[PDB]
Amino acid sequence: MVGLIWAQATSGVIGRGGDIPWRLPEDQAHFREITMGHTIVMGRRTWDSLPAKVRPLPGRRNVVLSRQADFMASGAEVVGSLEEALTSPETWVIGGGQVYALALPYATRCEVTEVDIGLPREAGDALAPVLDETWRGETGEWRFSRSGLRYRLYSYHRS
Ligand SMILES: NC(=O)C1=CN([C@@H]2O[C@H](COP(=O)(O)OP(=O)(O)OC[C@H]3O[C@@H](n4cnc5c(N)ncnc54)[C@H](OP(=O)(O)O)[C@@H]3O)[C@@H](O)[C@H]2O)C=CC1
Numbered sequence: 001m002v003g004l005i006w007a008q009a010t011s012g013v014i015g016r017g018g019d020i021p022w023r024l025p026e027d028q029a030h031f032r033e034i035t036m037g038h039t040i041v042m043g044r045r046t047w048d049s050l051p052a053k054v055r056p057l058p059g060r061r062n063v064v065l066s067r068q069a070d071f072m073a074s075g076a077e078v079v080g081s082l083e084e085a086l087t088s089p090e091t092w093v094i095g096g097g098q099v100y101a102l103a104l105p106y107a108t109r110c111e112v113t114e115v116d117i118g119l120p121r122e123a124g125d126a127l128a129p130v131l132d133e134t135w136r137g138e139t140g141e142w143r144f145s146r147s148g149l150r151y152r153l154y155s156y157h158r159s
């Protein structure tokens, strides 16, 4: 199973300036629940976005995708192609925009946290991948984060 997990503004923005223009503790907890114990695959930029203190994310097989054959990520596997990372029963692609797009053909699950933030798209933004007609999606209720933003979860699947 390859799944994608991400949070996006309504506009499709997932990242800006190498970080995220919001912070939902509830989505972090949800993220941790969904990925705990499994392989997490991320682009090198996303690895860089992780604070050195949470790095590697505990209890998960941290894999970083880089074309740099000598890139050192203390506590992770650095692989130069996505196929090297799919060697576990459950693999979660955790970002960023490039790796989401690269992984979409392998995916059967997308766990999408939609953040009700009017965030117009800007040059350089990392974007959520486009899901075609093969994806079947079920939505949750709009919830309120303690950060003040509303959010809801879309769970997409396809065979
Ligand atoms: N909202 C959310 O849910 C999340 C948002 N984000 C945000 O996403 C943004 C980063 O995403 P993005 O900028 O797209 O970069 P990524 O995090 O997708 O990593 C990009 C890097 O991945 C490597 N890479 C990409 N394609 C390939 C390939 N085909 N073969 C080998 N290596 C490859 C390269 O690493 P190298 O350059 O070393 O070769 C590239 O620079 C940040 O702002 C981050 O905060 C991240 C995670 C979750």
Ligand SMILES: Cc1c(C(=O)O)cnn1-c1ccccc1
Residues within 6 Å of the ligand: 007, 020, 022, 023, 024, 025, 027, 028, 031, 046, 049, 094, 095
């Ligand atoms: C910080 C964060 C949030 C948040 O703060 O809302 C939601 N996802 N992530 C996250 C970022 C990078 C990698 C994995 C997950």
Ligand SMILES: Cc1c(C(=O)O)cnn1-c1ccccc1
Residues within 6 Å of the ligand: 028, 031, 032, 049, 050, 051, 054, 057, 058
């Ligand atoms: C996703 C995450 C976890 C986790 O999933 O265990 C623990 N810290 N963070 C985190 C990452 C980036 C920024 C803030 C927090």
Ligand SMILES: [Co+2]
Residues within 6 Å of the ligand: 033, 034, 035, 036, 037, 038
């Ligand atoms: Co699990």
